Design a protein around this motif. Structure first.
Motif, PDB file in Angstrom:
ATOM      1  N   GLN A 182      -7.785   2.672   5.290  1.00 24.14           N
ATOM      2  CA  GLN A 182      -6.738   2.199   3.864  1.00 24.14           C
ATOM      3  C   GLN A 182      -8.010   2.164   2.858  1.00 24.14           C
ATOM      4  O   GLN A 182      -9.704   1.390   3.343  1.00 24.14           O
ATOM      5  CB  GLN A 182      -6.436   1.196   4.028  1.00 24.14           C
ATOM      6  N   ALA A 241       0.730  -1.189  -0.213  1.00 17.49           N
ATOM      7  CA  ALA A 241      -0.223  -0.157   0.303  1.00 17.49           C
ATOM      8  C   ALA A 241       1.172   1.198  -0.378  1.00 17.49           C
ATOM      9  O   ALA A 241       2.082   1.809   0.380  1.00 17.49           O
ATOM     10  CB  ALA A 241      -1.101  -0.309   1.217  1.00 17.49           C
ATOM     11  N   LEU A 242       0.367   2.284  -0.234  1.00 13.02           N
ATOM     12  CA  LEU A 242       0.571   3.478  -0.698  1.00 13.02           C
ATOM     13  C   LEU A 242       0.646   4.192   0.480  1.00 13.02           C
ATOM     14  O   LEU A 242      -0.591   4.754   1.185  1.00 13.02           O
ATOM     15  CB  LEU A 242       0.723   4.261  -1.697  1.00 13.02           C
ATOM     16  N   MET A 243       1.738   4.606   1.770  1.00 13.15           N
ATOM     17  CA  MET A 243       0.890   5.273   2.269  1.00 13.15           C
ATOM     18  C   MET A 243       1.955   7.149   2.738  1.00 13.15           C
ATOM     19  O   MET A 243       2.624   7.286   2.092  1.00 13.15           O
ATOM     20  CB  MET A 243       2.378   4.829   4.076  1.00 13.15           C
ATOM     21  N   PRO A 272      -3.466   0.345  -3.064  1.00 10.72           N
ATOM     22  CA  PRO A 272      -3.945   0.442  -1.423  1.00 10.72           C
ATOM     23  C   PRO A 272      -3.470   1.298  -1.468  1.00 10.72           C
ATOM     24  O   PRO A 272      -2.070   2.015  -1.888  1.00 10.72           O
ATOM     25  CB  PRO A 272      -4.083  -0.343  -1.068  1.00 10.72           C
ATOM     26  N   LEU A 273      -4.055   2.976  -0.807  1.00 14.72           N
ATOM     27  CA  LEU A 273      -3.981   4.185   0.061  1.00 14.72           C
ATOM     28  C   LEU A 273      -4.125   4.172   1.180  1.00 14.72           C
ATOM     29  O   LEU A 273      -5.675   4.050   1.971  1.00 14.72           O
ATOM     30  CB  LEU A 273      -4.921   5.334  -1.161  1.00 14.72           C
ATOM     31  N   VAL A 274      -2.961   4.188   1.947  1.00 13.99           N
ATOM     32  CA  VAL A 274      -3.308   4.213   3.484  1.00 13.99           C
ATOM     33  C   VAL A 274      -3.397   6.005   3.818  1.00 13.99           C
ATOM     34  O   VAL A 274      -2.058   6.605   3.191  1.00 13.99           O
ATOM     35  CB  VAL A 274      -2.877   3.904   4.420  1.00 13.99           C
ATOM     36  N   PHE A 275      -4.630   6.657   4.022  1.00 15.22           N
ATOM     37  CA  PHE A 275      -4.470   7.905   4.680  1.00 15.22           C
ATOM     38  C   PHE A 275      -4.475   8.305   5.657  1.00 15.22           C
ATOM     39  O   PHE A 275      -5.188   7.240   7.172  1.00 15.22           O
ATOM     40  CB  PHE A 275      -6.394   8.805   3.919  1.00 15.22           C
ATOM     41  N   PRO A 276      -4.087   9.700   6.582  1.00 12.87           N
ATOM     42  CA  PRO A 276      -4.201   9.367   7.928  1.00 12.87           C
ATOM     43  C   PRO A 276      -4.901  10.649   7.767  1.00 12.87           C
ATOM     44  O   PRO A 276      -5.640  10.800   8.080  1.00 12.87           O
ATOM     45  CB  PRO A 276      -2.580  10.792   7.877  1.00 12.87           C
ATOM     46  N   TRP A 331      -0.431  13.123  -2.500  1.00 13.51           N
ATOM     47  CA  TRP A 331      -0.830  11.903  -3.139  1.00 13.51           C
ATOM     48  C   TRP A 331      -1.402  12.976  -4.681  1.00 13.51           C
ATOM     49  O   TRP A 331      -1.649  12.230  -5.570  1.00 13.51           O
ATOM     50  CB  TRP A 331      -2.390  12.955  -2.515  1.00 13.51           C
ATOM     51  N   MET A 387      -3.060  -3.124   8.874  1.00 10.12           N
ATOM     52  CA  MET A 387      -2.597  -1.598   9.610  1.00 10.12           C
ATOM     53  C   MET A 387      -2.663  -2.358  11.442  1.00 10.12           C
ATOM     54  O   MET A 387      -4.126  -3.184  11.468  1.00 10.12           O
ATOM     55  CB  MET A 387      -2.967  -1.090   9.718  1.00 10.12           C
ATOM     56  N   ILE A 408       2.838   9.859   8.651  1.00 10.09           N
ATOM     57  CA  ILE A 408       2.244   8.515   9.223  1.00 10.09           C
ATOM     58  C   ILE A 408       3.853   8.099   9.393  1.00 10.09           C
ATOM     59  O   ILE A 408       4.737   7.439   8.616  1.00 10.09           O
ATOM     60  CB  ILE A 408       1.647   7.523   8.352  1.00 10.09           C
ATOM     61  N   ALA A 430      -5.569   5.971  10.569  1.00 15.55           N
ATOM     62  CA  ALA A 430      -5.727   5.846   9.748  1.00 15.55           C
ATOM     63  C   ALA A 430      -6.602   4.813   9.233  1.00 15.55           C
ATOM     64  O   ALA A 430      -7.581   4.480  10.112  1.00 15.55           O
ATOM     65  CB  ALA A 430      -4.319   5.255   8.924  1.00 15.55           C
ATOM     66  N   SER A 483      -0.422 -10.296   3.026  1.00 16.12           N
ATOM     67  CA  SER A 483      -0.892  -9.558   3.236  1.00 16.12           C
ATOM     68  C   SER A 483       0.341  -8.470   3.992  1.00 16.12           C
ATOM     69  O   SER A 483       1.131  -9.125   4.465  1.00 16.12           O
ATOM     70  CB  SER A 483      -2.089  -8.453   3.720  1.00 16.12           C
ATOM     71  N   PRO A 484       0.111  -7.445   2.980  1.00 14.04           N
ATOM     72  CA  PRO A 484       1.560  -6.301   3.694  1.00 14.04           C
ATOM     73  C   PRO A 484       1.612  -5.982   4.632  1.00 14.04           C
ATOM     74  O   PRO A 484       0.293  -5.995   5.204  1.00 14.04           O
ATOM     75  CB  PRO A 484       1.550  -5.270   2.096  1.00 14.04           C
ATOM     76  N   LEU A 485       2.518  -5.971   5.903  1.00 11.69           N
ATOM     77  CA  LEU A 485       1.575  -5.525   7.333  1.00 11.69           C
ATOM     78  C   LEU A 485       2.648  -3.760   7.490  1.00 11.69           C
ATOM     79  O   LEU A 485       3.609  -3.838   6.399  1.00 11.69           O
ATOM     80  CB  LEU A 485       2.521  -6.525   7.955  1.00 11.69           C
ATOM     81  N   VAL A 486       1.928  -3.483   7.957  1.00 12.75           N
ATOM     82  CA  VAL A 486       1.685  -2.229   8.236  1.00 12.75           C
ATOM     83  C   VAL A 486       2.897  -1.742   9.499  1.00 12.75           C
ATOM     84  O   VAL A 486       1.734  -2.469  10.646  1.00 12.75           O
ATOM     85  CB  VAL A 486       1.202  -0.916   8.061  1.00 12.75           C
ATOM     86  N   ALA A 499      -3.034  -3.454   2.905  1.00  5.71           N
ATOM     87  CA  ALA A 499      -2.086  -3.978   3.443  1.00  5.71           C
ATOM     88  C   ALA A 499      -2.756  -4.436   5.432  1.00  5.71           C
ATOM     89  O   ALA A 499      -4.118  -4.195   5.439  1.00  5.71           O
ATOM     90  CB  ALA A 499      -1.241  -3.040   4.312  1.00  5.71           C
ATOM     91  N   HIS A 525      -7.562  14.287   6.711  1.00  6.23           N
ATOM     92  CA  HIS A 525      -7.390  13.879   5.251  1.00  6.23           C
ATOM     93  C   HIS A 525      -9.031  13.593   4.646  1.00  6.23           C
ATOM     94  O   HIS A 525      -9.785  12.461   5.498  1.00  6.23           O
ATOM     95  CB  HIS A 525      -6.432  12.706   4.605  1.00  6.23           C
ATOM     96  N   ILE A 545      -2.874   3.257  14.748  1.00  9.27           N
ATOM     97  CA  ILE A 545      -2.033   3.975  13.902  1.00  9.27           C
ATOM     98  C   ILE A 545      -3.701   4.860  13.563  1.00  9.27           C
ATOM     99  O   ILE A 545      -4.081   4.052  12.767  1.00  9.27           O
ATOM    100  CB  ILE A 545      -0.756   3.331  12.671  1.00  9.27           C
TER     101      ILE A 545
END
Ligand SMILES: Nc1ncnc2c1ncn2[C@@H]1O[C@H](COCC#Cc2nc3c(N)ncnc3n2Cc2ccccc2)[C@@H](O)[C@H]1O
Ligand SMILES: Nc1ncnc2c1ncn2[C@@H]1O[C@H](COCC#Cc2nc3c(N)ncnc3n2Cc2ccccc2)[C@@H](O)[C@H]1O
Ligand SMILES: Nc1ncnc2c1ncn2[C@@H]1O[C@H](COCC#Cc2nc3c(N)ncnc3n2Cc2ccccc2)[C@@H](O)[C@H]1O
Ligand SMILES: Nc1ncnc2c1ncn2[C@@H]1O[C@H](COCC#Cc2nc3c(N)ncnc3n2Cc2ccccc2)[C@@H](O)[C@H]1O
Lengths: 257, 257, 257, 257
Positions: free
Chosen positions: D173, C163-165, D191-195, C247, D165, C169, D171, C190-193, D163, D198, D169
């Protein structure tokens, strides 16, 4: 008839091998690892892979059988407790054949793959122009590419998002390894399934050195002009003594057994 | 010979249609939308899809041609500026055929798909047992499933991670829609490519109502006992006047034109 | 104040560098590549990456600026035609800071990453036990792993499905490289954040030699006991002269510009 | 203090509920399902979800506890055999809080989500312009979109490739559902992760009717002008009596228990 048995090398496989040899001694069977008609592999798919490449020059004259001493393999699909029954039935079966992948590396060397053949860079960036039947399809930027046989689709191809193909389909499947996709670089992304007689050619852009794998073997090739992929005219032949469907093999290996 | 032309309905397509009809008037060509031998679609792949299902009962007696008034389509692969040349060449070509997908819904209704057939729940959770050639392969939990024809693999199948298959391969491809995978529920995850004569059967677990799509059409089916997927014995026939390779069509639609 | 300028090395970047130096000569600005307060990178993100690691020991005392002589980069987000305006505004801006990734390799060496740090095998199979805050999470089998910074998520992390963070963050993201998943081997997929103060530890199983990358640098490490990943306490500081949202940078680099 | 207990409704959960009520009768505890300070959910994550939305207007005044009568849930992380110990410890714990997602639907209605909120079309094609902090990011074509909370990332978000999370955090996604990507239509794919702070806004293009889901609830909304997503200022509060780390919960639910 003439036969031979390769082993994983552990205590379990060697003694299973010695018991089958002893069992074969009670029948009209001659051990011969030069010109066997039956090649038995005892171990995992890695052992079977080695047995395949050991005799890749006599594929039209050999029926392979795999026995798994550990977990279920896609090529070694016989339990060790069935070896005596296997010896018996083999003494007096049909043959099924799976497609193979031909890899040509020009600078010319040709290799046969039971699972797949992959291309990666020698360290720097991997950039190749992908040419399909002499038309330029894409310029690939990423970690590498993988061309899979049908039976190979359950192996490296699967981990890269490729589809599982039934081995009755004479085809090859190309999958990407971490392709870069932005405004300037563009790949297809999806796996590509090619039929017989389609030729996929990889051609360098800057670097001409590639790490090329074929099944377990991986060699650094220097001054490559082209890598050519196509469904082989040769096929591997299995001795089948009962019905073990491919989709059942997939279910037993990935869903549950 | 007998022919007909369907149109997208916009001003561009209708007047291209009227010009080709006028051009056909200068040749021994009879307009007939009941028993045509040539069906010309003017619009997009959606228009071609409608033209296909309009005459799905005379597929063995029709050669389809697609003209794209907007962007390039995979079935409408003729530019509008080539219609006059198309009229000329059609007056005096070979045929290529693509595989089709047969969908059987038992409660029995059968449908033919040029692109794909999908299954989703009627609102609640979608749970089906997936049966391949009468052996239970998996219990699918998720949003739904999609069975794609080869030429259909560039459409919905592609967006779900499926592989692109060359239409010369008589096969169908099953892809998952947002499958749940944890310790208790397990699917294969990878797309599955099935050859001719393999039957994939979806069978309910609790809910028996499913929203079933076939190409553009989507109908809520109630009290379903089984959904059967298999490569159709029927094929769609295209009139080809020149070489436009499938992989070039893929490149023009997805890489760049 | 003290400043320096690194260049891609091509004719375009060197002469843009000489013009800015000449422009800086008209102001109270001292060129110093030992203790600069302003580091200007002219080239691509690769040039900026090199500029970052050149001064990674004075991060708390440097504000970075990137100029892209070619396409838009995520760190070099200034057009060359704005260099004169950049010189002017820099003569008399605020600072924004992005998180960094700390990599510890015990046998002990520590590295800082602006984009990511990856681990692969030295040739054989890559098998590591993944430990999260001292609890064993998984045994990873595959090609490797990649731990990405937030701003690094648009780079290698993106090509691996991560994912794009947003860089506000303070986190790191772990993504898999061609993980094997069957009945016996199991990864999360899955990706892990991970947030700040979480420690991800990679630990060998058989082979103890790993090819470890940090941004562009890649070194073979031998006799590794552990690789530790955590969000760094240090941060990189950018000089911002206007609003260029992250973004929007993502949109310009991947959607269209 | 004041408490209440919701149940899955099966025999197992109802009698576990009656036993805890009886156990609470031995302490200074008042049952009250209007203004409880402790809300206990007995069942699965679906039961906990219902318990959450039942009291979503008193989140700042409630500590939730989940008990799983079946498999392990991410919110119901207490075994039934620990209810007596749970009653005891609850009689005399700290609180941990997870972020929530605010969904605003203008035509104006606002909803709170513990897991996620999704948008799909009312039947036809789903096309929305995605706007991030008032800048147009992309025009999405596909099946739909899903905006997930951190703790929600293990649910629908995970099945769509998002992902995982850590819930510390703050956020949200956004993940895509079967997005179309060709030469003309383009989405980010990742995927997009927003704080926090936003705002992601979905805006119609042709069709103005959308099927909007919030956790288990799904309502067809008509004449939608905009859907606004943002990290909520409200948080859900859990009563923790011991350490059960989130990554351990992930491991127990997905790797093995
Ligand atoms: N990331 C990777 N994911 C998957 N496989 C990878 C990866 N990296 C390299 N390999 C492979 O090593 C192979 C050489 O050794 C012998 C073999 C074999 C085999 N063949 C199959 C098969 N046809 N179906 C299912 N199981 C199989 N295995 C077992 C197996 C599963 C996973 C990893 C290794 C081995 C070569 O065939 C590459 O495919
Ligand atoms: N998420 C989705 N992604 C992709 N397609 C989806 C999705 N949802 C539903 N559809 C589809 O609508 C179709 C019915 O309308 C007519 C058609 C067609 C078509 N056929 C193809 C093709 N063979 N190759 C490339 N382009 C194609 N299009 C154009 C096209 C691309 C994307 C969306 C819609 C249409 C039905 O064929 C479903 O496949
Ligand atoms: N398969 C791969 N896909 C993506 N990147 C890969 C891959 N392999 C290795 N790298 C990378 O090489 C990097 C070292 O060189 C300098 C740089 C940079 C950079 N940074 C970013 C960024 N933050 N956002 C967007 N564009 C970026 N680039 C540009 C770029 C895009 C794609 C490939 C290479 C470079 C190292 O940062 C690895 O990430
Ligand atoms: N395809 C899909 N894949 C995944 N989930 C989907 C999908 N479709 C709809 N849902 C979901 O139904 C939910 C409403 O019911 C109650 C709940 C819950 C829950 N929450 C979580 C969680 N946070 N972590 C892990 N397990 C969870 N479950 C259990 C669970 C797993 C899979 C399917 C359904 C439920 C709503 O929260 C959607 O997320």
């Amino acid at each position: 008839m003439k036969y031979m048995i390769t082993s994983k090398g552990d205590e379990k496989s060697d003694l299973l091998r010695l018991n089958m040899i002893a069992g074969f001694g009670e029948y009209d069977m001659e051990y011969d690892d030069v010109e066997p008609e039956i090649v038995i592999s005892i171990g995992g798919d890695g052992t079977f892979l080695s047995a395949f490449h050991q005799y890749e020059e006599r594929l039209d004259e050999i029926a392979f059988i795999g026995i798994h001493t550990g977990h279920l393999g896609f090529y070694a699909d016989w339990r060790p407790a069935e070896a005596d029954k296997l010896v018996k039935l083999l003494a007096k079966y049909q043959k099924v054949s799976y497609p193979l992948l031909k890899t040509t590396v020009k600078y010319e060397a040709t290799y046969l793959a039971l699972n797949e053949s992959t291309v990666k860079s020698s360290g720097g960036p991997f950039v190749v122009d992908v040419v399909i039947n002499d038309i330029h399809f894409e310029r690939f930027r990423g970690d590498g590419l993988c061309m899979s046989t049908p039976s190979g689709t359950t192996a490296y191809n699967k981990s890269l998002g490729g589809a599982l193909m039934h081995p009755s389909i004479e085809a090859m499947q190309l999958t990407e390894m971490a392709s870069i996709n932005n405004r300037v670089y563009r790949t297809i992304g999806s796996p590509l399934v090619f039929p017989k007689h389609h030729v996929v050619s990889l051609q360098p852009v800057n670097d001409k050195d590639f790490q090329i794998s074929v099944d377990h073997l991986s060699i650094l090739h220097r001054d490559v002009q082209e890598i050519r992929y196509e469904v082989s005219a040769k096929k591997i032949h299995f001795a089948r003594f009962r019905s073990f469907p491919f989709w059942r093999r997939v279910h037993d290996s990935f869903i549950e057994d």
